[PDB]
Write a protein that binds this ligand. Structure first.
Ligand SMILES: CCCCCCCCCCCCCCCCCC(=O)OC[C@H](COP(=O)([O-])OCC(O)COP(=O)([O-])OC[C@@H](COC(=O)CCCCCCCCCCCCCCCCC)OC(=O)CCCCCCCCCCCCCCCCC)OC(=O)CCCCCCCCCCCCCCCCC
Ligand code: BCL
Ligand code: BCL
Ligand code: BCL
Ligand SMILES: CC[C@H]1c2cc3[nH]c4c(c3C)C(=O)[C@H](C(=O)OC)c4c3nc(cc4[nH]c(cc(n2)[C@@H]1C)c(C(C)=O)c4C)[C@@H](C)[C@@H]3CCC(=O)OC/C=C(\C)CCC[C@H](C)CCC[C@H](C)CCCC(C)C
Ligand SMILES: CC[C@H]1c2cc3[nH]c4c(c3C)C(=O)[C@H](C(=O)OC)c4c3nc(cc4[nH]c(cc(n2)[C@@H]1C)c(C(C)=O)c4C)[C@@H](C)[C@@H]3CCC(=O)OC/C=C(\C)CCC[C@H](C)CCC[C@H](C)CCCC(C)C
Ligand SMILES: COC1=C(OC)C(=O)C(C/C=C(\C)CC/C=C(\C)CC/C=C(\C)CC/C=C(\C)CC/C=C(\C)CC/C=C(\C)CC/C=C(\C)CC/C=C(\C)CC/C=C(\C)CCC=C(C)C)=C(C)C1=O
Ligand SMILES: COC(C)(C)C/C=C/C(C)=C/C=C/C(C)=C/C=C/C(C)=C/C=C\C=C(C)\C=C\C=C(/C)CC/C=C(\C)CCC=C(C)C
Ligand SMILES: CCCCCCCCCCCC[N+](C)(C)[O-]
Ligand SMILES: CCCCCCCCCCCC[N+](C)(C)[O-]
Ligand SMILES: CCCCCCCCCCCC[N+](C)(C)[O-]
Ligand SMILES: CCCCCCCCCCCC[N+](C)(C)[O-]
Ligand SMILES: CCCCCCCCCCCC[N+](C)(C)[O-]
Ligand SMILES: [Cl-]
Ligand SMILES: [Fe+3]
Lengths: 301, 240, 281
């Protein structure tokens, strides 16, 4: 009983430049190497990547965010490489003090640098979002990947932009640091009367656990019926095989209801997006509408 | 207050979504039937969705689901009891008849095409220039059955071109003919390929393919069905 | 009632125990020996919970809570009303979970499919047994286990967590959260990519896996592929739950101090321990 977690044999052919459709091939790179290592688990082929204008705008924008934090971390380390490595987790680029409110007027050494790093990150993600849409259009595919990535952007937007604005200060935003953003998270909960009483936090968790449950179930199922070419999900949608039937009937006989080879992917995208969707609402209502979720919880309203 | 409105709103939305999702997952297998194949009276509280139509690429036309459902094959089973809910016993040889774990589906008797409308799955000898890049090369190894008898030798790998992975070994039998074995149902070892599902005497009865350089979705289902059926049905002849 | 394609699969055989005795369906549900075992342990378990609710003087789902024995009972039995119901209910629960896993094995055997689903489920069972059996037994009392109640179990997470300071600092807990977060990303992307191919721009033909592979190379320069993404999802989600159990097996046992303080192993390394400046010194 071989289990199909790793391949027993790799086969390689000429590198794959991919489908064309309306893609501008001027903007695609050359294929990178193959990877035997990767090739045991998935595809061996690195590349080619498509880098148009939006890619470079995003990538340049995104490195500027990373270096902007990194330069502050060096300053804090007093430019000592040993200290930098020692305290890497303890460094933190914090937002402007409540004093400066929603003003872009605070000095570099007191959150002005946080605003710069944030502006770069805002450009980075939004350009990258435009890129997920446009790369799909060019291949004539649905925009599921862009509408799903929006759900994640929603929580990130609420945490560092929308909610800070509605509270009326940049100090309400998340510091760029490893241990410091953990503290922010812990401290956020305490100040709001414990997020376990925030009913949106509770659903957020249900979905985050459902995402783990459902991909365990889905993954395991496809591997169980990969002996009838189950992984070939599009041709099983177009023309149902014993793979799709045995997959469905496993679940019908276990728990009394089942999915289709297409329908399971609707369960999937929704289970996952509902994490960051309920998440964002929970955070957005925290400090704006509800002071204390324990207290709110007592009235239910 | 704004938070209570938001959460009451959400639960209403979540209900409509669970309803939307359930009806979406009724586009195949429904409506439900009795064991005799007439439509069951109780269908559940969810209705059938309005049909949707996929346009299959490469001039293969359309699929519309939900649509009319028939097996388009005979089922060699008979009831073992006078009421619903009991097993149905194979009336013949379940491996030959293609029932239970040996079940296949009447899929299109065409091969899956890649994005460019070429065949997805070629023998590696007709795939320029696919080679084995890593792991043991199974080509030339003897194929042993669960009865620890040699049934044949591997003479090629059938490869997915666009996903670049091995999907079948082509096995030459005592008689000079070949068969395909799912890559997922064999253990490639240093010195042989081991097949747990089948004994040596059942390799002959693996369904054969009508063309030597392509395999159709129907043929795939028959081969894979037959091999998986072996786990239940060739159990008398399995050692350890 | 049966699915249109179901009858050809409802043949006899595949049972581990009982042979053909429990080898039947009730509506959609397969039964089998382990079907009966599940109903037994689950029925008895639900009686015991209602009994627990009677003693406690409440029929409110949001209030019913079955508590472990108090720490002074150690690893012995306790009176039904002061930890014994929890102990019996914990046996019943373990019985129903393991029964459910073995029932999935019999279904795997009938259908001639692999055993990946019950194997994956066994990781969830391990996590539960870490919390209610393995960790309490290493710490020397059933009292360290979580209570069976909707809000009281959340109360336990908060108290257990905050015992060790801010629990974020557990390094196994850090890895575990990473795998949960990543698995959600992976599920979002997998669901979206298949749907974007089957449901392309209005009036176009169904895309191929080639379009799927092409899309991901265009976006990030690598595609793991259609078999890879299914392997990856199984591994991300099973890993998340592995590191979850590991983060709690070590908490209370080999480490009982503040988790934040653990991280001094790195800061106090001798070759930068004394170097002035930075956050530490
Ligand atoms: C914050 C932002 C979060 C956005 C999350 C979007 C999830 C994406 C899922 C999806 O299917 O999107 C594809 C879908 C269409 O993709 P496409 O590539 O254009 O179409 C290709 C195919 O032709 C067609 O592709 P398709 O057929 O796969 O997609 C059809 C899709 C069409 O999807 C929709 O109609 C989107 C539904 C709205 C999403 C917004 C959720 C808001 C939550 C409210 C919470 C309330 C709290 C108070 O149908 C549905 O899924 C129907 C949803 C059922 C909702 C039930 C309503 C219950 C009412 C209560 C009684 O995207 C959208 O509809 C855009 C949504 C943008 C919202 C702003
Ligand atoms: C995992 C680490 C912690 C834990 C930390 C948290 C945190 C934090 C939260 C929860 C929340 C929940 N936890 Mg918990 N929880 C733990 C262990 C458990 C165990 C167990 C091991 O037996 C169970 C059954 C539950 C069940 C629950 C639900 C009541 C709720 C949402 C679960 C969910 O969506 O998952 C995904 C599964 C699905 C989507 C499938 C459906 C599962 C259904 C919903 C489970 C029904 C449980 C039912 C009430 C049990 C009694 C019925 C019996 C038959 C008698 N938790 C341990 C101790 N749990 C959330 C909540 O809202 O609490 C009030 C929440 O915020
Ligand atoms: C002491 C801590 C508090 C607590 C305080 C908070 C706070 C505060 C928050 C949460 C949030 C969440 N909590 Mg909590 N939480 C607690 C205890 C728990 C417990 C538990 C007891 O076991 C669990 C399971 C959870 C679980 C969760 C999640 C469901 C939720 C985050 C969802 C998510 O996916 O974000 C991860 C996803 C994102 C952040 C989206 C990111 C998307 C962007 C666009 C990505 C950009 C990447 C960038 C470009 C970098 C690129 C780098 C490289 C290229 C890779 N909490 C306790 C009570 N929790 C969040 C929430 O939703 O609240 C309701 C949140 O804000
Ligand atoms: C204030 C609280 C502390 C904290 C204290 C703790 C404590 C204490 C624990 C965790 C644990 C976890 N924490 Mg923490 N944690 C905190 C903040 C977080 C944050 C965050 C964003 O802040 C996140 C994302 C997490 C995430 C996590 C996970 C890594 C982990 C829980 C998953 C798990 O074990 O599944 C495992 C899944 C199960 C146990 C479910 C098993 C289900 C069984 C098998 C079947 C049940 C069937 C059911 C009864 C049937 C119902 C009927 C049907 C519906 C018909 N924590 C804060 C800072 N955290 C837990 C852990 O690691 O557990 C091992 C843990 O004990
Ligand atoms: C359902 C919600 C979940 C989700 C969804 C999601 N995320 C997404 C997407 C989707 C659908 C994308 O399409 C997009 C992507 O391209 O994925 C490959 C993305 C993405 N989510 C990412 C990260 C990410 N998502 C997270 C969360 C989540 N993603 C949720 C759990 C997290 C967590 C847990 O904090 C992280 C860290 C990226 C891999 C990518 C967005 C890339 C981006 O915006 O790039 C900007 C930055 C640079 C180009 C420069 C990087 C600097 C150097 C490190 C190099
Ligand atoms: C390991 C990866 C993830 C995973 C995987 C996974 N779960 C699975 C499976 C798999 C592969 C199944 O095959 C199986 C299934 O059928 O899926 C629908 C299942 C399953 N996982 C489930 C739930 C579940 N999984 C969870 C977690 C996870 N499951 C992981 C994140 C959680 C979380 C996050 O908390 C829950 C709630 C069920 C829907 C199902 C198992 C059903 C089962 O065992 O049924 C038999 C028993 C009963 C019908 C109930 C018995 C009742 C008891 C005797 C009394 C109650 C005792 C209990 C301790 C009460 C405590 C409640 C309080 C905490 C509120
Ligand atoms: C592509 O392939 C795939 C499919 O198909 C094509 C699938 O279907 C599925 C399955 C997944 C879905 C249908 C999606 C929806 C699933 C979830 C969101 C997961 C959450 C699950 C639940 C809420 C269901 C839980 C219910 C259970 C366990 C049933 C319990 C109820 C009972 C009354 C049963 C009683 C118990 C016993 C002992 C059995 C009967 C015995 C006697 C009467 C005796 C997957 C994963 C898949 O990948
Ligand atoms: C070694 O040296 C090198 C060269 C490598 C440089 C070093 C790099 C290093 C060490 C990098 C380390 C980076 C780290 C640790 C970063 C951590 C980031 C984390 C954990 C982020 C967490 C959360 C972030 C959120 C929620 C941010 C939200 C941001 C927004 C929503 C954008 C908001 C935008 C604002 C405020 C600006 C608006 C302005 C205009 C004009 C629109
Ligand atoms: C998740 C991405 C990286 C995965 C790489 C793991 C490599 C595993 C190699 C397996 C060894 C080969 N073997 C013996 C299984 O055939
Ligand atoms: C998961 C991250 C993978 C990123 C891989 C990116 C591959 C890009 C290939 C660039 C080709 C350039 N060159 C000279 C090596 O051929
Ligand atoms: C894709 C839909 C799946 C539905 C999952 C529903 C899980 C129920 C979670 C209950 C949590 C309720 N609470 C306490 C947060 O208000
Ligand atoms: C609160 C979450 C609990 C949800 C459990 C729902 C299980 C669905 C069972 C479906 C069986 C229906 N039936 C018998 C008509 O086939
Ligand atoms: C946690 C949410 C998941 C459970 C959703 C409930 C859906 C039950 C569907 C039963 C349909 C049964 N039937 C008759 C159509 O085969
Ligand atoms: Cl593991
Ligand atoms: Fe899939």
């Amino acid at each position: 009983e071989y289990q199909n977690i790793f391949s027993q044999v790799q086969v390689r052919g000429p590198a794959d430049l991919g489908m064309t459709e309306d893609v501008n091939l001027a903007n695609r790179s050359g294929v990178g190497p193959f990877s035997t290592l990767l090739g045991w688990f998935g595809n061996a082929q690195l590349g080619p990547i498509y880098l148009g204008s939006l890619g470079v705008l995003s990538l340049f924008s995104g490195l500027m965010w990373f270096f902007t934090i990194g330069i502050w971390f060096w300053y804090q380390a007093g430019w000592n490489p040993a200290v930098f490595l020692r305290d890497l987790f303890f460094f933190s680029l914090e937002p402007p003090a409540p004093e400066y409110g929603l003003s872009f007027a605070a000095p570099l050494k007191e959150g002005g640098l946080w605003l710069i790093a944030s502006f770069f990150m805002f450009v980075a993600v939004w350009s990258w979002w435009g890129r997920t849409y446009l790369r799909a259009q060019a291949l004539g595919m649905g925009k599921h990947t862009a509408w799903a990535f929006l759900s994640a952007i929603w929580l990130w937007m609420v945490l560092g932009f929308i909610r800070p604005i509605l509270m009326g200060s940049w100090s309400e935003a998340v510091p760029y640091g490893i241990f410091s953003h953990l503290d922010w998270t812990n401290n956020f909960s305490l100040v709001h009367g414990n997020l376990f009483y925030n009913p949106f936090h509770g659903l957020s968790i249900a979905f985050l656990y459902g995402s783990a449950l459902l991909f365990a179930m889905h993954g395991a199922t496809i591997l169980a019926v990969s002996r009838f070419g189950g992984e070939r999900e599009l041709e099983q949608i177009a023309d149902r095989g014993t793979a799709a039937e045995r997959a469905a009937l496993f679940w019908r006989w276990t728990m009394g209801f089942n999915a289709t080879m297409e329908g399971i992917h609707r369960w999937a995208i929704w289970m996952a997006v509902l994490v960051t969707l309920t998440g964002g609402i929970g955070i957005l209502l925290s400090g704006t509408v509800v002071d204390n979720w324990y207290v709110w919880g007592q009235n239910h309203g | 207050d704004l938070a209570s409105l938001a959460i009451y709103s959400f639960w209403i939305f979540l209900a409509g979504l669970i309803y939307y999702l359930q009806t979406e997952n009724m586009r195949e297998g429904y409506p439900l039937e009795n064991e005799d194949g007439t439509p069951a009276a109780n269908q559940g509280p969810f209705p059938l969705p309005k049909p949707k139509t996929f346009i299959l690429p490469h001039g293969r036309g359309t699929l519309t689901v939900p649509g009319p459902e028939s097996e388009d094959r005979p089922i060699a089973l008979a009831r073992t009891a006078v009421s619903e809910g009991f097993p149905h016993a194979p009336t013949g040889d379940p491996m030959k008849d293609g029932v239970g774990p040996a079940s296949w589906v009447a899929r299109r008797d065409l091969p899956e095409l890649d994005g460019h409308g070429h065949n997805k799955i070629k023998p590696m000898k007709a795939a320029a220039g696919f080679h084995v890049s890593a792991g043991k090369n199974p080509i030339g190894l003897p194929v042993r059955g669960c009865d620890l008898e040699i049934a044949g030798k591997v003479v090629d790998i059938w490869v997915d071109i666009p996903e670049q992975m091995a999907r079948f070994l082509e096995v030459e039998l005592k008689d000079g003919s070949t068969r395909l074995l799912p890559m997922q149902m064999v253990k490639v070892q240093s010195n042989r390929v081991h097949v747990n599902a089948l004994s040596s005497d059942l390799f002959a009865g693996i369904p054969t393919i009508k063309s030597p350089t392509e395999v159709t979705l129907l043929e795939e289902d028959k081969i894979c069905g037959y091999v998986a059926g072996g786990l239940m049905y060739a159990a008398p002849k399995r050692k350890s | 009632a049966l699915l249109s394609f179901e009858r050809k699969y409802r043949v006899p055989g595949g049972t581990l125990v009982g042979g053909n005795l429990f080898d039947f369906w009730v509506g959609p549900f397969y039964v089998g020996f382990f079907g009966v075992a599940t109903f037994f342990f689950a029925a008895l378990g639900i009686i015991l919970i209602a009994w627990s609710a009677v003693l406690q003087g409440t029929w409110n789902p949001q209030l019913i809570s079955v508590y472990p024995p108090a720490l002074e009972y150690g690893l012995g039995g306790a009176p039904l009303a002061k930890g014994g119901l929890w102990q019996i209910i914990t046996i019943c629960a373990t019985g129903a979970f393991v029964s459910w896993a073995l029932r999935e094995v019999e279904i795997c055997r009938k259908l001639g499919i692999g055993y990946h689903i019950p194997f994956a489920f066994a990781f969830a069972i391990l996590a539960y047994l870490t919390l209610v059996l393995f960790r309490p037994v290493m710490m020397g009392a059933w009292g360290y286990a979580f209570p069976y109640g909707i809000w009281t179990h959340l109360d336990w997470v908060s108290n257990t967590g905050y015992t060790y300071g801010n629990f974020h600092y557990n390094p196994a807990h850090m890895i575990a959260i990473s795998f949960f977060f990543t698995n959600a990303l992976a599920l979002a992307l997998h669901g979206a990519l298949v749907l974007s191919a089957a449901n392309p721009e209005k009036g176009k033909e169904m895309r191929t896996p080639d379009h799927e592979d092409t899309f991901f190379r265009d976006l990030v320069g690598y595609s793991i592929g259609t078999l890879g993404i299914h392997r990856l999802g199984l591994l991300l989600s099973l890993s998340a739950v592995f590191f979850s159990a590991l983060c709690m097996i070590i908490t209370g046992t080999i480490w009982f101090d503040q988790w934040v303080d653990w991280w001094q192993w790195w800061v106090k390394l001798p070759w930068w321990a004394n170097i002035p400046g930075g956050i530490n010194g």
